[PDB]
Design an enzyme around this catalytic site. Sequence first.
Site, PDB file in Angstrom:
ATOM      1  CG  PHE A   1      -4.216   8.023   5.666  1.00  0.00           C
ATOM      2  CD1 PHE A   1      -3.565   7.172   5.190  1.00  0.00           C
ATOM      3  CD2 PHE A   1      -4.956   7.813   6.713  1.00  0.00           C
ATOM      4  CE1 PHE A   1      -3.224   5.923   5.841  1.00  0.00           C
ATOM      5  CE2 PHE A   1      -4.942   6.752   7.601  1.00  0.00           C
ATOM      6  CZ  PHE A   1      -4.104   5.723   7.262  1.00  0.00           C
TER       7      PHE A   1
ATOM      8  CE  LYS B   1      -0.059   7.440   0.307  1.00  0.00           C
ATOM      9  NZ  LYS B   1      -0.592   7.288   1.551  1.00  0.00           N
TER      10      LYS B   1
ATOM     11  CE1 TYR C   1       3.008  11.983  -0.976  1.00  0.00           C
ATOM     12  CE2 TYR C   1       3.950  10.086  -0.476  1.00  0.00           C
ATOM     13  CZ  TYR C   1       3.846  10.822  -1.217  1.00  0.00           C
ATOM     14  OH  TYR C   1       4.494  11.053  -2.435  1.00  0.00           O
TER      15      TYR C   1
ATOM     16  N   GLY D   1      11.499  -3.393   4.168  1.00  0.00           N
ATOM     17  CA  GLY D   1      12.869  -3.694   3.809  1.00  0.00           C
ATOM     18  C   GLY D   1      13.308  -4.925   2.982  1.00  0.00           C
TER      19      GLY D   1
ATOM     20  CB  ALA E   1      -0.915   0.090   1.282  1.00  0.00           C
TER      21      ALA E   1
ATOM     22  CB  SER F   1      -0.238   0.261  11.926  1.00  0.00           C
ATOM     23  OG  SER F   1      -0.326  -0.079  10.433  1.00  0.00           O
ATOM     24  CB  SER F   2      -1.060   5.675   9.215  1.00  0.00           C
ATOM     25  OG  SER F   2      -0.497   6.816   8.778  1.00  0.00           O
ATOM     26  N   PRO F   3       1.765   6.093  11.082  1.00  0.00           N
ATOM     27  CG  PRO F   3       3.808   6.342  10.532  1.00  0.00           C
ATOM     28  CD  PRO F   3       2.802   5.746  10.107  1.00  0.00           C
ATOM     29  CG  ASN F   4       2.769   9.617   8.538  1.00  0.00           C
ATOM     30  OD1 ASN F   4       3.668  10.196   9.565  1.00  0.00           O
ATOM     31  ND2 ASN F   4       3.152   8.863   7.650  1.00  0.00           N
ATOM     32  CB  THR F   5      -3.621   9.734  10.575  1.00  0.00           C
ATOM     33  OG1 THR F   5      -3.579   9.900   9.344  1.00  0.00           O
ATOM     34  CG2 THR F   5      -5.229  10.196  11.016  1.00  0.00           C
TER      35      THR F   5
ATOM     36  CG  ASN G   1       2.142   1.367   8.276  1.00  0.00           C
ATOM     37  OD1 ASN G   1       2.884   2.202   7.502  1.00  0.00           O
ATOM     38  ND2 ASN G   1       0.749   1.332   8.366  1.00  0.00           N
TER      39      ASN G   1
ATOM     40  CG  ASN H   1       5.507   8.116   4.274  1.00  0.00           C
ATOM     41  OD1 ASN H   1       4.261   8.335   4.451  1.00  0.00           O
ATOM     42  ND2 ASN H   1       5.997   6.974   4.584  1.00  0.00           N
TER      43      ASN H   1
ATOM     44  CE  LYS I   1       1.146  -1.850   5.854  1.00  0.00           C
ATOM     45  NZ  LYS I   1       1.163  -1.289   4.864  1.00  0.00           N
TER      46      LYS I   1
END
EC number: 1.3.5.2
Lengths: 365, 365
Positions: free
Chosen positions: A118, A69, A116, A304, A65, A183-187, A253, A114, A224
Amino acid sequence: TGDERFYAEHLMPTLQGLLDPESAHRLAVRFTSLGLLPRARFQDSDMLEVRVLGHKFRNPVGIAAGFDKHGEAVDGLYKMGFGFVEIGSVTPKPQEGNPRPRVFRLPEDQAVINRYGFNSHGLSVVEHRLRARQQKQAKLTEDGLPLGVNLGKNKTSVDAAEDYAEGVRVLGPLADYLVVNVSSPNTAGLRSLQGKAELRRLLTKVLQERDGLRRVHRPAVLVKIAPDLTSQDKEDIASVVKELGIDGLIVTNTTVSRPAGLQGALRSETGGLSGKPLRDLSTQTIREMYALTQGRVPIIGVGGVSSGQDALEKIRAGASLVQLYTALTFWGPPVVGKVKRELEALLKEQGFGGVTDAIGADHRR
Amino acid sequence: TGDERFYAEHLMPTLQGLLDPESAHRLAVRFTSLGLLPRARFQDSDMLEVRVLGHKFRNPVGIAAGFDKHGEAVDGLYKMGFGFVEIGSVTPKPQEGNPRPRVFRLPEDQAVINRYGFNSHGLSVVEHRLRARQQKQAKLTEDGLPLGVNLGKNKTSVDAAEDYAEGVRVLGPLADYLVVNVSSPNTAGLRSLQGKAELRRLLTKVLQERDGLRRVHRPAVLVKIAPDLTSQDKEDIASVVKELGIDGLIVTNTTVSRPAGLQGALRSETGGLSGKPLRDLSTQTIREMYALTQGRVPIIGVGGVSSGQDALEKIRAGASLVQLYTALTFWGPPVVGKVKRELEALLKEQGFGGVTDAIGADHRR
Ligand SMILES: Cc1cc2nc3c(=O)[nH]c(=O)nc-3n(C[C@H](O)[C@H](O)[C@H](O)COP(=O)(O)O)c2cc1C
Ligand SMILES: Cc1cc2nc3c(=O)[nH]c(=O)nc-3n(C[C@H](O)[C@H](O)[C@H](O)COP(=O)(O)O)c2cc1C
Ligand SMILES: CC[C@@H](C)c1ccc(-c2nc3ccc(Br)cc3c(C(=O)O)c2C)cc1
Ligand SMILES: CC[C@@H](C)c1ccc(-c2nc3ccc(Br)cc3c(C(=O)O)c2C)cc1
Ligand SMILES: CCCCCCCCCCC[N+](C)(C)[O-]
Ligand SMILES: CCCCCCCCCCC[N+](C)(C)[O-]
Ligand SMILES: O=C(O)c1cc(=O)[nH]c(=O)[nH]1
Ligand SMILES: O=C(O)c1cc(=O)[nH]c(=O)[nH]1
C-alpha cells in the site's frame, strides 16, 4: 493483431529485459498519463454494454486496482479501451509501502508476485487530483465509462474501520463505486477483516458513512475478497453482504498460495501472486460467491484474465464485469482490444445476444 | 460453426436430458462405430503435424482413454478428426466394473465424475477386435493416425506387474504406444504403484516384456499419472522415467480432489473428476513434469481441454500432444474441429511456425 504481435513478441519482452518491474510500472503510468499511446482502434459494439451498480458500462473490461494507485493515469486508461477504471488502493495518510525490491516477474508462469504494501500518495493528494478532472469524469461516466476508487488502511492505523470511513468521506463523492479492500496479503492483520464479526462492524460503518453523502455523490460500495478464503469465510461474507445490502463484490485479489507447478525462479518470494496461476482459483471463487448470493449481488471478476475466453469463463461463472492487470504487463496495451474482440466473437458463437445474457449462464445449465 | 452451435446448444443438451450418462456413452460408442456421424469437414494443415514417439501425428488432438474402452469405435473416431486414438483401459480378464450408477454429470461445472472401475471385455476380446483391422491400422499409422492402447489391472489380481506384463505381450504387438495406467482413482491400491520402488519394479518388468517383442511390433511405453501427486511423488516418477528410459508420460488422469467452487448437485459422489475443474491442475502437472524431465520426455497433455486455447496452454506448458474426453460429452463431435481450428489460429497469432515450435515454449520465456 499485427500491433498485438509486435507488442507481445517484441516491445514488451524488450522493456522487461531492460527494466526491473517497479521501474517499468512507473514508466508505464507516466506514459499512459501523458497519452503517449495511440488511441485504441477497437470500436465497442452494443453487445458489450452492461448495466450494473447504477451505471452503464460501455464494455465489461476494466483495469484492476494497483496499476494506477494514485489516480494519475485515468484518462490514458480510458484511451486504452478499458470500459471502467479503478484507482487505488489509497490509504488515508501518505505512506511509502515496503522496502525495494517488492515486485517480481515470473515470466515462465505469466505471473507476478508483489509485496508493495500500500504505497500511497494518500487521500488528500488523490482527492485534489480527482477534483481537477471531476466534471470530465462526470461526462465519461454518463457516456458509459465509470470510475472506481479502491480504499486501503495505513500500516500504523489503530482503527481500521475509521481508515475506511475517512476514505468514504473524502473519495466517495468523487467515485462511481468504492471498494473496501480487506484482501491485500501485504498489510499485517488486514485479511482478518474478512471474518464475520469484523466485517459486519466494518461494513456497517462504511455503509453509514456512504449513506451520509449527498444523493448525486453517493457511490456503490463493493468488498474485494481474497482467493484464499475457507468455505466458512465465504459463507460468512455472503451472509453479511446480504444482511447489509452491500452493492457488489470484487473477486479476487492476489493469492498467498503458490500452486504446484510454478516454474519462475522467484516463486518463493513473499507477496501476492497474480496472473495465469491465479486464473481458475479466481473463477471458482466467483462461481461460489454467485451461488451463495443467489445471483443477486453483482460481481466484478478478476484474476488471470488475458483473453476473451478467460473473460467469458468468469462472466458465465457469475461476473457482471471483469478486470485485468497482470496480462497488461506481458502483452501490453493491445491486450485490451484483444480481450474485447475475442469476447464478442465467443458471445456470438455461444448464442448469447450480449454480455448481459451470459452473466451466470453456467449456473442455469 | 453452425454445426458447432447446433450440437452444443440443441442436440447434446437434448441427449443429456433424455439419457443417463452411461446409456448415452454406450449409444455414442455404437453410433461412432457404425460411422453414423458425417465425416468431419476440417482439413488438417501441415502446421498441426507432430513427430514424436517414433510416429507422425497428422494433428495433435487425440481421444483420451475411457471413451472406447474395448476398441469398438477406432475407425469412427478417426472419422471425427482425432489425430490419434487411445483405447482402454483393458484388463487381462473380463470384468464388470462397479455397480450402477457409476457415472455422473456436473453440467454447471462442465465436469463428470466417474467410478466405472475398469469395466473391460478383457485382453482376448480386444486382441481379436484389433487383429481384425490390424492392416487397416498399419496404413492409418503410416498416414499419421497412430493407435494407443491403455492397460489396466484386474480387481482381484494378486500381482499387478504380471497383469501389465500380460497386456504388453497380448496388445503390445497391435499398438503404436502402450500406456501403463497406474493412476485410476477407482481400483483399490492402484495409485500406490506410482510410488518410487513399486514403480521401478513394475516398469522394469513392462520394459523387459516390450523389448522382447519383434522390432516391427515394438510399441513405445508411456506412464499415465494422477493430478493428485505430492511433489515427492512427481520427483520420484521423473527420476524413474529417466533411469529406465520410459518413452513418455500421459498427464493427467482424473482427480480425486473436489476443487472449491463446484456447483453440481452430484459433486460429492465418489470417483474421478474430469472436465473444466481439472484443466489447470493438469496443465500445472504438465509444466512440472516437463521441467523435471528437462524437456526430454514427450508428454501427452490431458484434462479439461475444450478449446484451442486450452490445447495451446498445455502445449506451451510442455505437451507434445493433447487428448480430450469430457468436452466431447458436452459439445459433441464438432468440438474436435473447433479445437483444431482455434489451435491453428492461435499458433499463427503467437508467431509459431507450427505445433512443434510451441512445445514447452513457456519454459523458454
Ligand atoms: C503489482 C500489483 C499491485 C496491486 N495493487 C493492488 C491494490 O493496491 N489494491 C487492490 O485491491 N488490488 C491490487 N492488486 C490486485 C489486482 O487488483 C488484481 O486483483 C490481481 O492482480 C488479479 O488480477 P490479474 O491477475 O489480472 O493481475 C495488485 C496487483 C498487482 C500485480
Ligand atoms: C467416463 C470416463 C472413463 C474413463 N476411463 C479411463 C480409463 O479406462 N483409463 C484411463 O487411463 N483414463 C480414463 N479416463 C480419464 C481420461 O482418459 C482423461 O485422463 C480424463 O478424463 C481427463 O480428460 P478430460 O477432462 O478431457 O475428460 C476416463 C475418464 C472418464 C470421464
Ligand atoms: C504504457 C506503455 C505500455 C507500452 C506499457 C504497459 C505496461 C508496462 C508494464 N507495466 C507494468 C506494471 C506493473 C508491473 Br509490477 C510491471 C509492469 C511491466 C513489467 O513487467 O516490467 C511493464 C512492462 C510497460 C509499458
Ligand atoms: C457419437 C454421437 C455423438 C452425437 C455423441 C457423442 C457423445 C455422446 C455422449 N457421450 C458420452 C460418453 C461418456 C459419458 Br460418461 C457421457 C456421455 C454423454 C453424456 O453426457 O450423456 C454423451 C452425450 C453422445 C453422442
Ligand atoms: C514517510 C514518508 C511517507 C510518504 C509516502 C510517499 C508517497 C508514496 C510513494 C509512491 C511512489 N511515488 C509515486 C511517489 O513515487
Ligand atoms: C463376472 C462377469 C465378468 C465379465 C465382464 C463383462 C465385460 C465388461 C462389461 C462392459 C459392458 N458391455 C460393453 C459388455 O456392455
Ligand atoms: O499494495 C499492495 O501490496 C497490494 C495490495 C493489494 O490489495 N493486493 C496486492 O496484491 N498488493
Ligand atoms: O474405469 C475407471 O473407473 C477409470 C479408470 C481411469 O483410469 N480413470 C478414470 O477416471 N476412471
